[PDB]
Design a protein around this ligand. Structure first.
Ligand SMILES: C/C(=C/C(=O)c1ccccc1)N[C@@H](Cc1ccc(OCCc2nc(-c3ccccc3)oc2C)cc1)C(=O)O
Lengths: 13, 267
């Protein structure tokens, strides 16, 4: 899983 | 009522996406002023196209890395950008930004590709599809002339797109449809199931009513689309499988980290 990038992209950009 | 929602979602859509059905159809037939797409129908024309699209895949050892991997890379790029526009679109969705971030990155994980192949149908026709923002056009025939399994990847997308484009949906239908696919309250690992569901009921309803007035004559279009949601789901499954193969029987075609985690523990 992790998804460290999908998180970084939901913040604001 | 929820109609101010329909327009809400549609505005976010028109903003977050660079290419849309409207432009796609004008390009894929209609010259008008000018700018007829360069056709990549074989290896020569492929290299001709890359020569411009890189100065990176034309003079960097990549000018001669199997064509299948070069292409796999360009599609990879389109996914990354689209997954990116897809994230903003979802956040601009009433309710999405109020959910737990983990449920967000859960809806995006399972709906992102269903969305991709849906919107990609817009730029496809029975003979091929637009590439590079509508500047190029790669033939359906050239893609099946590749070695396996690369030659088996798009054919299913073309069959789905031909049946899907017959429904003649426009951009407004697609925005709601895409929101409906993304806000699916049946995804795995979903924490706050309860809410995501009602959210779904909302947009689906809105969509039902929208198609009902926008396409009064296609009568059973809403149910047709419901079926196409399930179709997209299976297409994704098949595509993901198709990639796992390559990924381990074609070490030269690596996947972008963003896409790496989406596929990662998917189906
Ligand atoms: C990683 C990956 C590979 C994949 O699907 C493939 C590889 C090899 C052969 C056939 C298919 N596919 C994606 C999902 C995807 C995105 C975009 C897309 O079309 C985008 C349109 C487009 N643009 C070009 C192109 C542009 C410039 C030079 C050469 C080719 O080609 C295509 C099909 C098709 C499919 C995924 O798993 O994330």
């Amino acid at each position: 899983e992790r998804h460290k990038i999908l998180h970084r992209l939901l913040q604001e950009g | 009522d929820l109609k101010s929602l329909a327009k809400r979602i549609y505005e976010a859509y028109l903003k977050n996406f660079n290419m849309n059905k409207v432009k796609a159809r004008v390009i894929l037939s209609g010259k008008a002023s000018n700018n007829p797409p360069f056709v990549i129908h074989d290896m020569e024309t492929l290299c001709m196209a890359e020569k411009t699209l890189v100065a990176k895949l034309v003079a960097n050892g990549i000018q001669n890395k199997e064509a299948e991997v070069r292409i796999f890379h360009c599609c990879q790029c389109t996914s990354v950008e689209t997954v990116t526009e897809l994230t903003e679109f979802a956040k601009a969705i009433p309710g999405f930004a109020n959910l737990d971030l983990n449920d967000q990155v859960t809806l995006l994980k399972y709906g992102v590709y269903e969305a991709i192949f849906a919107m990609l149908s817009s730029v496809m026709n029975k003979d091929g599809m637009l590439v590079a923002y509508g500047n190029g056009f790669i033939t359906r025939e050239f893609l099946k002339s590749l070695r396996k399994p690369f030659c088996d990847i798009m054919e299913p997308k073309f069959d789905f797109a031909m049946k899907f484009n017959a429904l003649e949906l426009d951009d407004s239908d697609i925005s709601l449809f895409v929101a409906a696919i993304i806000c699916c309250g049946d995804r795995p690992g979903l924490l706050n199931v309860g809410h995501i569901e009602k959210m779904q009921e909302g947009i689906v309803h809105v969509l039902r009513l929208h198609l009902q007035s926008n396409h009064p004559d296609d009568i059973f279009l809403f149910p047709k689309l419901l079926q196409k949601m399930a179709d997209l789901r299976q297409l994704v499954t098949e595509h993901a499988q198709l990639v796992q193969i390559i990924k381990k029987t074609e070490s030269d075609a690596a996947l972008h980290p963003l896409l790496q985690e989406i596929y990662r523990d998917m189906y």
